[PDB]
Design a protein. Structure first.
Lengths: 5, 304
């Protein structure tokens, strides 16, 4: 989820 | 004095956005985690691919090393953490108890405990040997963006989209301090300074700040980069000149002079948000990683 805005 | 970081290697292999890069404490390895559910291991000094580590069922947002460089813990959307034996690649333990995505994770310096933060708004403290949840901190009122132990593990700092940084006594669970400026932008990253006296905090208003947490005061502010959407890691570069290092949503690695707050370098090359930077424990090396239009890791080396 860190890779999602 | 300014660093002269220059691109030495690009590392490719992850098939989705990279979430996290970390150098092993013994300086031999870089660990990368990714939305593609995989952990990858690379040589720290040439970026040579070493192995893939797998088992998480959904994407991974963080990975961290044990002090002896033998273990890794990863934080996954699958709502678990996994303790890995790097040399064998086996999952040693699956840490369950969070009720939503696990977003961030770290060993304590002794590496007998793991701290985690989750979308479920809690911080959990885990026994590495047994894989059991020792304690849960009802830490925040929004997702927990980062968790970090201080130099001797007696304290935990967490950050959250609720706009707070909280310092916890690890053993008693007590919130020793709650830190916030005169606004409340989500706090997207926090970590103790090496000397344990400060916390470096990122907020989603394009600002990093250096706090004396004891005094509860902001001592330094760093701006110029772009950070409004992603929990971007930030570092104290300590091997040579004292820098602050961070990725940025304009695809750059920013380096500030810690004392003066001036931007001293901007590393170009990535083609997407630089989500994560890491600083090698003994060499003036920075590792950086980028999201889904890039998916690569870059190793940068400086003379100072």
């Amino acid at each position: 989820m860190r890779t999602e805005p | 004095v300014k660093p002269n970081y220059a691109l030495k290697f690009t590392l490719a292999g992850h098939t989705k956005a990279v979430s996290s890069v970390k150098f092993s404490p013994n300086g031999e390895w870089l660990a990368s985690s990714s939305a593609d559910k995989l952990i990858k291991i690379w040589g720290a000094y040439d970026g040579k691919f070493e192995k893939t580590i797998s088992g998480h069922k959904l994407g991974i947002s963080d990975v961290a090393w044990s002090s002896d460089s033998n273990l890794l813990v990863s934080a996954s959307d699958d709502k678990t953490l996994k303790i890995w034996d790097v040399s064998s690649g086996k999952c040693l333990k699956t840490l369950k108890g969070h009720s939503n995505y696990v977003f961030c994770c770290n060993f304590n310096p002794q590496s007998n405990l793991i701290v985690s933060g989750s979308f479920d708004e809690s911080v959990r403290i885990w026994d590495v040997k047994t894989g059991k949840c020792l304690k849960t901190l009802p830490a925040h009122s929004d997702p927990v963006s980062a968790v970090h132990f201080n130099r001797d593990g007696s304290l935990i700092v967490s950050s959250s989209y609720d706009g707070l940084c909280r310092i916890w006594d690890t053993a008693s669970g007590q919130c020793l301090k709650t830190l916030i400026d005169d606004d409340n932008p989500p706090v997207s990253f926090v970590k103790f300074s090496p000397n344990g006296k400060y916390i470096l905090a990122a907020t989603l208003d394009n600002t990093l700040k250096l706090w004396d947490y004891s005094k509860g005061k902001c001592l330094k502010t760093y701006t110029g980069h772009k950070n409004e959407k992603y929990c971007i890691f930030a570092n104290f570069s300590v091997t040579g000149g004292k820098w602050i290092v961070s990725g940025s949503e304009d695809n750059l690695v920013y380096i500030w002079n810690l004392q003066t707050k001036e931007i001293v370098q901007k590393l170009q090359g990535h083609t997407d948000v630089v989500i994560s930077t890491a600083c090698h424990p003994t060499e003036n090396i920075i590792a950086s990683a980028a999201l889904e239009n890039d998916k690569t890791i870059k190793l940068w080396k400086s003379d100072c």
